[PDB]
């Protein structure tokens, strides 16, 4: 779909993966607090 | 070039998506074990 359109695609995917990463951090911290 | 760099980023993101899924699986495993 071209270089520009592919770059916007990658940016959007990276931004949403950061949302994923933040939520996995929250999940680990939840478990860690409960365990300890 | 830019084309071969964009292909690199695509492959890296896709494989990093695999990683995230398995770390999600781990959190869900521990969470199910606790509750």
């Amino acid at each position: 779909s071209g270089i520009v359109q592919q770059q916007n695609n990658l940016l959007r995917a990276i931004k949403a993966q950061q949302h994923l990463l933040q939520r996995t951090v929250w999940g680990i911290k939840q478990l860690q607090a409960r365990i300890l | 070039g830019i084309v071969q760099q964009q292909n690199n980023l695509l492959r890296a993101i896709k494989a990093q998506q695999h990683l995230l899924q398995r770390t999600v699986w781990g959190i869900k495993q521990l969470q199910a074990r606790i509750l």
């Binding site: 695609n9 995917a13 949403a16 994923l20 939520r23 929250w26 | 695509l10 998506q17």
Partner: peptide
Amino acid sequence: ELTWEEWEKKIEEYTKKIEEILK
């Protein structure tokens, strides 16, 4: 304050949002 089941759905939401951007 976010509950595990609300957490699970947000994962799926963003996960599918990723597949749609790549696929």
